[PDB]
Amino acid sequence: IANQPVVIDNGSGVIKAGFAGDQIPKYCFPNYVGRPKHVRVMAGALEGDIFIGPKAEEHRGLLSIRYPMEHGIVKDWNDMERIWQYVYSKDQLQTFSEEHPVLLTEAPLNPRKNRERAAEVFFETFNVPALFISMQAVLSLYATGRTTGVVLDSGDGVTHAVPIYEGFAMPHSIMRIDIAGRDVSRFLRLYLRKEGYDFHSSSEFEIVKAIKERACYLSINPQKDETLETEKAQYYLPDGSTIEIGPSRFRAPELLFRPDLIGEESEGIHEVLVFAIQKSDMDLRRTLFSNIVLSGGSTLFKGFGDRLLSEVKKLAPKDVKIRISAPQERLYSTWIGGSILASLDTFKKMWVSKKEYEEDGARSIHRKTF
Protein backbone atom coordinates (compact mmCIF):
# COMPACT_ATOMS: atom_id res chain seq x y z
CA ILE A 1 0.00 0.00 0.00
CA ALA A 2 1.24 3.53 -0.81
CA ASN A 3 0.42 5.22 2.52
CA GLN A 4 2.37 6.89 5.31
CA PRO A 5 4.52 4.50 7.39
CA VAL A 6 4.03 3.85 11.10
CA VAL A 7 7.19 4.05 13.22
CA ILE A 8 6.99 2.02 16.44
CA ASP A 9 9.70 2.05 19.11
CA ASN A 10 9.42 -0.99 21.36
CA GLY A 11 10.61 0.80 24.45
CA SER A 12 11.21 -1.51 27.34
CA GLY A 13 9.35 0.85 29.60
CA VAL A 14 7.85 3.54 27.38
CA ILE A 15 6.64 2.40 23.98
CA LYS A 16 6.85 5.30 21.56
CA ALA A 17 4.96 5.22 18.28
CA GLY A 18 3.22 7.21 15.56
CA PHE A 19 3.17 7.89 11.85
CA ALA A 20 6.35 8.95 10.09
CA GLY A 21 7.01 12.51 8.99
CA ASP A 22 6.05 13.89 12.40
CA GLN A 23 9.02 15.37 14.22
CA ILE A 24 8.03 14.96 17.89
CA PRO A 25 5.80 11.91 18.53
CA LYS A 26 2.30 12.80 19.68
CA TYR A 27 1.48 9.28 20.95
CA CYS A 28 3.50 8.14 23.96
CA PHE A 29 2.27 5.70 26.55
CA PRO A 30 4.06 3.41 28.99
CA ASN A 31 4.70 -0.25 28.26
CA TYR A 32 2.67 -2.18 30.81
CA VAL A 33 -0.66 -3.91 31.26
CA GLY A 34 -2.64 -3.58 34.48
CA ARG A 35 -5.47 -5.75 35.66
CA PRO A 36 -7.94 -4.79 38.42
CA LYS A 37 -7.07 -6.03 41.88
CA HIS A 38 -10.29 -5.48 43.81
CA VAL A 39 -13.55 -7.19 42.93
CA ARG A 40 -16.12 -5.18 41.03
CA VAL A 41 -19.47 -5.09 42.78
CA MET A 42 -21.36 -2.00 41.77
CA ALA A 43 -22.92 -2.01 38.32
CA GLY A 44 -21.71 0.48 35.77
CA ALA A 45 -18.10 0.02 36.82
CA LEU A 46 -15.12 0.07 34.48
CA GLU A 47 -15.22 -2.20 31.47
CA GLY A 48 -12.38 -4.15 29.89
CA ASP A 49 -10.11 -5.39 32.73
CA ILE A 50 -7.05 -4.62 30.54
CA PHE A 51 -5.95 -0.99 30.71
CA ILE A 52 -3.10 0.53 28.68
CA GLY A 53 -2.11 4.14 28.15
CA PRO A 54 -3.50 7.11 30.02
CA LYS A 55 -6.34 5.05 31.46
CA ALA A 56 -3.83 2.96 33.35
CA GLU A 57 -2.13 6.12 34.53
CA GLU A 58 -5.33 7.56 35.86
CA HIS A 59 -6.53 4.40 37.61
CA ARG A 60 -3.30 3.31 39.21
CA GLY A 61 -5.09 2.43 42.42
CA LEU A 62 -6.84 -0.52 40.83
CA LEU A 63 -4.44 -2.10 38.43
CA SER A 64 -1.91 -4.79 39.26
CA ILE A 65 0.71 -3.34 36.93
CA ARG A 66 2.85 -5.97 35.27
CA TYR A 67 5.40 -5.53 32.56
CA PRO A 68 5.50 -7.48 29.31
CA MET A 69 9.07 -6.62 28.32
CA GLU A 70 12.00 -6.97 30.71
CA HIS A 71 15.57 -6.33 29.54
CA GLY A 72 14.55 -6.08 25.91
CA ILE A 73 13.20 -9.59 25.77
CA VAL A 74 9.46 -10.18 25.58
CA LYS A 75 8.27 -12.51 28.32
CA ASP A 76 4.50 -12.28 27.66
CA TRP A 77 3.50 -12.22 24.01
CA ASN A 78 -0.20 -11.89 24.84
CA ASP A 79 0.39 -8.60 26.59
CA MET A 80 2.60 -7.34 23.79
CA GLU A 81 -0.10 -8.23 21.30
CA ARG A 82 -2.57 -6.25 23.36
CA ILE A 83 -0.24 -3.27 23.53
CA TRP A 84 0.43 -3.46 19.81
CA GLN A 85 -3.33 -3.52 19.32
CA TYR A 86 -3.63 -0.52 21.61
CA VAL A 87 -1.28 1.37 19.35
CA TYR A 88 -3.86 0.91 16.61
CA SER A 89 -6.75 1.58 18.99
CA LYS A 90 -9.03 4.62 18.94
CA ASP A 91 -6.60 6.73 21.00
CA GLN A 92 -3.19 6.46 19.37
CA LEU A 93 -3.57 5.98 15.60
CA GLN A 94 -7.30 5.40 14.90
CA THR A 95 -6.40 3.33 11.82
CA PHE A 96 -5.72 -0.31 10.93
CA SER A 97 -2.66 -2.46 11.50
CA GLU A 98 -3.12 -4.08 8.08
CA GLU A 99 -2.99 -1.10 5.70
CA HIS A 100 0.19 0.86 6.53
CA PRO A 101 3.97 0.31 6.53
CA VAL A 102 5.34 -0.51 9.99
CA LEU A 103 8.78 0.26 11.45
CA LEU A 104 9.72 -1.59 14.64
CA THR A 105 12.77 -0.83 16.69
CA GLU A 106 14.61 -3.32 18.89
CA ALA A 107 17.55 -3.39 21.16
CA PRO A 108 20.77 -4.57 19.52
CA LEU A 109 22.16 -8.08 19.87
CA ASN A 110 18.72 -9.44 20.73
CA PRO A 111 18.13 -13.19 20.35
CA ARG A 112 17.01 -14.51 17.00
CA LYS A 113 13.81 -15.98 18.46
CA ASN A 114 12.55 -12.52 19.47
CA ARG A 115 12.73 -11.23 15.92
CA GLU A 116 11.20 -14.50 14.73
CA ARG A 117 8.18 -14.32 17.05
CA ALA A 118 7.79 -10.60 16.40
CA ALA A 119 7.60 -11.36 12.71
CA GLU A 120 5.06 -14.12 13.38
CA VAL A 121 2.91 -11.70 15.34
CA PHE A 122 3.19 -8.74 12.96
CA PHE A 123 2.49 -10.92 9.92
CA GLU A 124 -0.15 -13.42 11.10
CA THR A 125 -2.08 -11.51 13.79
CA PHE A 126 -1.60 -8.11 12.21
CA ASN A 127 -1.64 -8.40 8.43
CA VAL A 128 1.03 -5.72 8.05
CA PRO A 129 1.82 -5.02 4.38
CA ALA A 130 5.30 -3.57 5.03
CA LEU A 131 7.42 -4.35 8.10
CA PHE A 132 11.00 -3.25 8.76
CA ILE A 133 13.06 -3.76 11.90
CA SER A 134 16.10 -1.78 12.95
CA MET A 135 18.26 -0.78 15.90
CA GLN A 136 17.83 1.91 18.54
CA ALA A 137 21.20 3.54 17.83
CA VAL A 138 21.37 4.04 14.05
CA LEU A 139 18.17 6.01 14.28
CA SER A 140 19.52 8.18 17.09
CA LEU A 141 22.55 9.21 15.05
CA TYR A 142 20.20 9.77 12.13
CA ALA A 143 18.20 12.15 14.32
CA THR A 144 21.32 13.98 15.44
CA GLY A 145 22.45 14.13 11.82
CA ARG A 146 26.04 13.11 12.51
CA THR A 147 27.85 10.61 10.33
CA THR A 148 30.14 8.66 12.65
CA GLY A 149 29.84 8.29 16.38
CA VAL A 150 29.09 6.14 19.37
CA VAL A 151 25.51 5.94 20.57
CA LEU A 152 25.15 5.46 24.31
CA ASP A 153 21.43 5.14 24.89
CA SER A 154 19.69 3.76 27.93
CA GLY A 155 16.12 2.56 27.85
CA ASP A 156 14.17 1.30 30.77
CA GLY A 157 15.47 -2.21 30.18
CA VAL A 158 18.94 -1.90 28.63
CA THR A 159 21.99 0.39 28.36
CA HIS A 160 23.81 -0.43 25.16
CA ALA A 161 26.75 1.36 23.59
CA VAL A 162 26.99 1.22 19.81
CA PRO A 163 29.81 2.75 17.75
CA ILE A 164 28.33 3.68 14.39
CA TYR A 165 30.49 4.36 11.35
CA GLU A 166 28.95 6.47 8.56
CA GLY A 167 25.40 5.48 9.38
CA PHE A 168 26.07 1.85 10.17
CA ALA A 169 26.52 0.02 13.42
CA MET A 170 29.59 -2.14 13.44
CA PRO A 171 28.38 -5.54 14.70
CA HIS A 172 31.90 -6.36 15.82
CA SER A 173 31.87 -3.72 18.54
CA ILE A 174 28.38 -3.56 20.04
CA MET A 175 28.30 -3.61 23.83
CA ARG A 176 25.18 -4.46 25.79
CA ILE A 177 24.51 -4.99 29.49
CA ASP A 178 21.23 -5.91 31.19
CA ILE A 179 21.06 -2.91 33.50
CA ALA A 180 18.89 0.19 33.15
CA GLY A 181 16.57 2.64 34.84
CA ARG A 182 14.12 -0.01 36.01
CA ASP A 183 16.84 -1.71 37.96
CA VAL A 184 17.79 1.65 39.38
CA SER A 185 14.20 2.06 40.44
CA ARG A 186 14.23 -1.32 42.13
CA PHE A 187 17.47 -0.42 43.86
CA LEU A 188 15.88 2.84 44.90
CA ARG A 189 12.92 0.93 46.32
CA LEU A 190 15.37 -1.12 48.34
CA TYR A 191 16.88 2.02 49.81
CA LEU A 192 13.47 3.46 50.56
CA ARG A 193 12.76 0.26 52.45
CA LYS A 194 16.06 0.94 54.17
CA GLU A 195 14.64 4.33 55.11
CA GLY A 196 11.11 3.42 56.18
CA TYR A 197 9.11 4.57 53.17
CA ASP A 198 8.52 1.08 51.83
CA PHE A 199 6.41 0.73 48.68
CA HIS A 200 5.93 -2.99 48.21
CA SER A 201 3.29 -2.79 45.50
CA SER A 202 3.38 -2.80 41.73
CA SER A 203 0.63 -0.24 41.56
CA GLU A 204 2.72 1.79 43.97
CA PHE A 205 5.99 1.03 42.17
CA GLU A 206 5.40 3.79 39.65
CA ILE A 207 5.59 6.28 42.50
CA VAL A 208 9.13 5.06 43.06
CA LYS A 209 9.65 5.52 39.36
CA ALA A 210 8.49 9.09 39.66
CA ILE A 211 10.88 9.58 42.55
CA LYS A 212 13.67 8.28 40.32
CA GLU A 213 12.62 10.57 37.50
CA ARG A 214 12.37 13.62 39.69
CA ALA A 215 14.71 13.66 42.69
CA CYS A 216 17.75 11.59 41.79
CA TYR A 217 21.12 12.90 40.71
CA LEU A 218 24.54 11.39 40.17
CA SER A 219 27.35 12.50 42.44
CA ILE A 220 30.79 13.30 41.06
CA ASN A 221 32.63 12.42 44.25
CA PRO A 222 32.00 8.71 44.90
CA GLN A 223 33.23 8.98 48.48
CA LYS A 224 32.94 12.60 49.64
CA ASP A 225 29.26 12.62 48.69
CA GLU A 226 28.93 9.20 50.29
CA THR A 227 30.23 10.47 53.63
CA LEU A 228 28.01 13.58 53.51
CA GLU A 229 24.85 14.41 55.43
CA THR A 230 22.53 16.03 52.91
CA GLU A 231 19.64 18.36 53.66
CA LYS A 232 17.11 15.51 53.10
CA ALA A 233 15.21 17.05 50.20
CA GLN A 234 11.56 16.23 50.75
CA TYR A 235 9.20 14.89 48.13
CA TYR A 236 5.42 14.76 48.09
CA LEU A 237 3.65 11.47 47.55
CA PRO A 238 0.67 11.45 45.17
CA ASP A 239 -1.75 11.56 48.11
CA GLY A 240 -0.48 14.49 50.13
CA SER A 241 2.20 12.83 52.21
CA THR A 242 5.91 13.66 52.45
CA ILE A 243 9.10 11.62 52.08
CA GLU A 244 12.45 12.77 53.46
CA ILE A 245 14.72 10.92 51.04
CA GLY A 246 18.12 11.91 52.34
CA PRO A 247 21.23 9.82 51.68
CA SER A 248 19.64 7.55 49.13
CA ARG A 249 18.73 9.91 46.32
CA PHE A 250 22.25 9.68 44.88
CA ARG A 251 23.27 6.15 45.82
CA ALA A 252 20.41 4.79 43.76
CA PRO A 253 21.61 6.11 40.35
CA GLU A 254 25.12 4.79 41.12
CA LEU A 255 24.00 1.40 39.85
CA LEU A 256 24.64 2.50 36.28
CA PHE A 257 28.36 2.89 37.00
CA ARG A 258 29.03 -0.13 39.14
CA PRO A 259 26.63 -3.08 38.86
CA ASP A 260 28.28 -4.67 41.87
CA LEU A 261 25.87 -2.77 44.06
CA ILE A 262 23.10 -5.03 42.85
CA GLY A 263 25.48 -7.96 42.61
CA GLU A 264 25.54 -8.62 38.90
CA GLU A 265 28.56 -9.58 36.82
CA SER A 266 28.71 -6.65 34.39
CA GLU A 267 30.42 -3.31 33.90
CA GLY A 268 29.36 0.29 34.29
CA ILE A 269 28.06 2.52 31.49
CA HIS A 270 31.35 4.38 31.28
CA GLU A 271 33.26 1.13 31.09
CA VAL A 272 30.75 -0.09 28.52
CA LEU A 273 31.45 2.92 26.32
CA VAL A 274 35.22 2.51 26.76
CA PHE A 275 35.06 -1.09 25.65
CA ALA A 276 32.67 -0.22 22.84
CA ILE A 277 35.21 2.12 21.32
CA GLN A 278 38.24 -0.02 22.06
CA LYS A 279 36.64 -3.03 20.37
CA SER A 280 36.72 -1.08 17.13
CA ASP A 281 39.73 -0.33 14.92
CA MET A 282 42.44 2.23 15.57
CA ASP A 283 41.40 4.25 12.52
CA LEU A 284 38.30 5.64 14.23
CA ARG A 285 39.13 5.93 17.94
CA ARG A 286 40.02 9.61 17.60
CA THR A 287 36.71 10.34 15.91
CA LEU A 288 34.58 8.10 18.10
CA PHE A 289 36.00 9.70 21.25
CA SER A 290 34.91 13.07 19.89
CA ASN A 291 31.48 11.85 18.74
CA ILE A 292 29.31 10.54 21.57
CA VAL A 293 25.56 11.06 21.76
CA LEU A 294 23.70 10.40 25.02
CA SER A 295 20.36 9.08 23.88
CA GLY A 296 17.89 7.06 25.91
CA GLY A 297 15.55 8.07 28.69
CA SER A 298 17.63 6.74 31.58
CA THR A 299 20.49 9.08 30.66
CA LEU A 300 18.63 12.15 31.97
CA PHE A 301 20.12 12.15 35.44
CA LYS A 302 21.35 15.44 36.80
CA GLY A 303 25.07 14.98 36.30
CA PHE A 304 25.25 11.85 34.19
CA GLY A 305 27.38 13.20 31.36
CA ASP A 306 29.70 14.99 33.76
CA ARG A 307 30.60 11.88 35.71
CA LEU A 308 30.86 10.05 32.38
CA LEU A 309 33.43 12.57 31.20
CA SER A 310 35.39 12.12 34.41
CA GLU A 311 35.33 8.33 34.14
CA VAL A 312 36.31 8.38 30.48
CA LYS A 313 39.22 10.66 31.42
CA LYS A 314 40.22 8.04 33.93
CA LEU A 315 39.94 5.23 31.36
CA ALA A 316 40.55 6.52 27.80
CA PRO A 317 44.14 7.20 26.56
CA LYS A 318 46.23 10.32 27.24
CA ASP A 319 44.24 13.57 26.87
CA VAL A 320 42.30 12.46 23.82
CA LYS A 321 39.48 14.61 22.41
CA ILE A 322 36.47 13.55 24.49
CA ARG A 323 33.33 15.21 23.11
CA ILE A 324 29.95 14.03 24.39
CA SER A 325 26.82 15.64 23.01
CA ALA A 326 23.60 15.95 25.01
CA PRO A 327 20.62 16.40 22.69
CA GLN A 328 17.54 17.90 24.33
CA GLU A 329 15.28 15.56 22.31
CA ARG A 330 17.06 12.61 23.97
CA LEU A 331 13.79 10.91 24.85
CA TYR A 332 12.73 10.51 21.22
CA SER A 333 15.98 10.37 19.23
CA THR A 334 15.26 6.84 18.13
CA TRP A 335 11.73 7.69 17.02
CA ILE A 336 12.89 10.77 15.11
CA GLY A 337 15.44 8.60 13.36
CA GLY A 338 12.68 6.12 12.70
CA SER A 339 10.71 8.82 10.91
CA ILE A 340 13.86 9.67 8.94
CA LEU A 341 14.52 6.07 7.86
CA ALA A 342 10.81 5.53 7.15
CA SER A 343 10.29 8.65 5.02
CA LEU A 344 13.05 7.60 2.60
CA ASP A 345 12.50 6.77 -1.05
CA THR A 346 15.06 3.98 -0.75
CA PHE A 347 13.03 2.48 2.12
CA LYS A 348 10.70 0.86 -0.48
CA LYS A 349 13.18 -2.04 -0.85
CA MET A 350 14.37 -2.86 2.70
CA TRP A 351 11.13 -4.09 4.27
CA VAL A 352 10.41 -7.79 3.99
CA SER A 353 7.20 -8.15 2.01
CA LYS A 354 4.23 -10.05 3.41
CA LYS A 355 4.29 -12.66 0.62
CA GLU A 356 8.03 -13.28 1.11
CA TYR A 357 7.57 -13.98 4.81
CA GLU A 358 4.39 -16.07 4.43
CA GLU A 359 6.07 -18.25 1.81
CA ASP A 360 9.58 -18.35 3.30
CA GLY A 361 9.64 -17.66 7.04
CA ALA A 362 11.67 -15.67 9.54
CA ARG A 363 14.90 -17.08 8.08
CA SER A 364 14.25 -14.92 5.04
CA ILE A 365 14.00 -11.90 7.32
CA HIS A 366 17.31 -12.77 8.97
CA ARG A 367 18.77 -13.10 5.46
CA LYS A 368 17.25 -9.74 4.51
CA THR A 369 16.91 -7.51 7.55
CA PHE A 370 19.79 -5.61 9.13
Partner 1 sequence: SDQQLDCALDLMRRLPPQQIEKNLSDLIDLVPSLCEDLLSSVDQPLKIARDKVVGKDYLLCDYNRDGDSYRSPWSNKYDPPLEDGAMPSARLRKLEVEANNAFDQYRDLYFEGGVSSVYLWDLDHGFAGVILIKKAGDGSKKIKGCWDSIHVVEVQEKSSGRTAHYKLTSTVMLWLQTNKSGSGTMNLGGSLTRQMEKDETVSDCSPHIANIGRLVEDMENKIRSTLNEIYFGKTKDIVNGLRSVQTFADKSKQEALKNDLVEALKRKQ
Partner 2 sequence: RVSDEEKVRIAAKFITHAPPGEFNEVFNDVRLLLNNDNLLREGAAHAFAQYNMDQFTPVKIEGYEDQVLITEHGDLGNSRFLDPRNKISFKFDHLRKEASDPQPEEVDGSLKSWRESCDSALRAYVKDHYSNGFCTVYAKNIDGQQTIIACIESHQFQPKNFWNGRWRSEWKFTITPPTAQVVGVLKIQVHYYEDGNVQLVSHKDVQDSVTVSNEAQTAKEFIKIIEHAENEYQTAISENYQTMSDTTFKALRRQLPVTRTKIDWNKILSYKIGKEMQ
Ligand X SMILES: Nc1ncnc2c1ncn2[C@@H]1O[C@H](COP(=O)(O)OP(=O)(O)O)[C@@H](O)[C@H]1O
**Binding region for partner 2 (CB under 8 A):** 260, 263-265, 280-284, 340-341, 344, 346, 349-350, 367-368, 370
Q: Please identify, using beta-carbon distances, which residue of 17 and 340 lies nearer to partner 1.
A: 340
Does 30 engage in binding with ligand X (CB under 6 A)?
no
Kindly determine how many residues on this chain lie close enough to bind partner 1 according to the rule CB under 8 A: 21
Pairing of strands 101-106, 130-135: parallel
Phi, psi (degrees; rounded to nearest 5) at 114: -70, -45
Name residues contacting a copy of itself, limited to 75-134 (CB under 8 A): none
User: Residue 328, exposed/middle/buried by CB under 10 A (0-12, 13-18, 19+)?
Assistant: exposed
- Whole-number Å distance between alpha carbons of 75 and 80: 9
Could you say which of ligand X, a copy of itself, partner 2, none residue 42 binds, taking C-beta under 5 to 8 angstroms by partner kind?
none
Q: Which is nearer to a copy of itself, 27 or 191 (CB)?
A: 191
Interface mask (CB under 8 A) for partner 1, residues 166-185, using x and -?
Answer: xxx---xx-x----------
> What is 85-116 written as a DSSP string?
HHHTSTTTT-S-SSSSEEEEEE-TT--HHHHH
Give the DSSP letter of residue 240.
S
Query: Of 76 and 106, which CB lies nearer to partner 1 in the complex structure?
Result: 106
| Interface residue with a copy of itself, options 202, 290, 325, 369 (CB under 8 A) | 202
> What gap in Å lies between CA 218 and CA 300, rounded to an integer?
10
Size of the site for a copy of itself (CB under 8 A): 13
Taking alpha carbons only, the member of 123, 83, 71 closest to residue 102 is: 123
Interatomic CA distance for residues 351 and 131, integer angstroms: 5
> Looking at 63-71, 83-91, 182-190, 343-351, which segment touches partner 1 (CB under 8 A)?
343-351
Rounded-to-integer distance, Cα 217 and Cα 234, Å = 14
Helices (H), 167-283: 181-193, 202-212, 269-278
Q: At what angle do helices 202-212 and 181-193 cross, to 10 degrees?
A: 100
Nearer to partner 1, 9 or 271 (CB): 271
Q: Convert 43-73 into a string of H (helix), E (strand) and C (coil).
A: CCCCCCCCECCHHHHHCCCCEEEECCEECCE
* Using rule CB under 6 A, residue 215 touches ligand X: no
In the complex, minimum distance from the CB of residue 4 to a copy of itself, in angstroms, rounded to a whole number:
42
Question: Is residue 156 near ligand X by the rule CB under 6 A?
Answer: yes
Which of ligand X, partner 2, a copy of itself, none is residue 68 near (CB under 5 to 8 Å by kind)? none
Partner interacting with residue 14 (select from ligand X, a copy of itself, partner 1, none; CB below 5-8 Å by kind):
ligand X
Q: What is the dihedral of CA 184, 186, 189, 191, to 10 degrees?
A: -60
Question: Does 23 help bind partner 1 (rule: CB under 8 A)?
Answer: no
130 binds partner 1 (CB under 8 A): no
Q: Exactly one of 89, 95, 148, 203 binds a copy of itself (CB under 8 A); which one?
A: 203
Does position 275 bind partner 1 by CB under 8 A?
yes
Is there binding between residue 96 and partner 1 (CB under 8 A)?
Answer: no
Q: Is 280 helix (H, G, I), strand (E, B) or coil?
A: coil
Q: Which positions lie near a copy of itself, rule CB under 8 A?
A: 37-38, 64, 200-203, 227, 263-266, 363
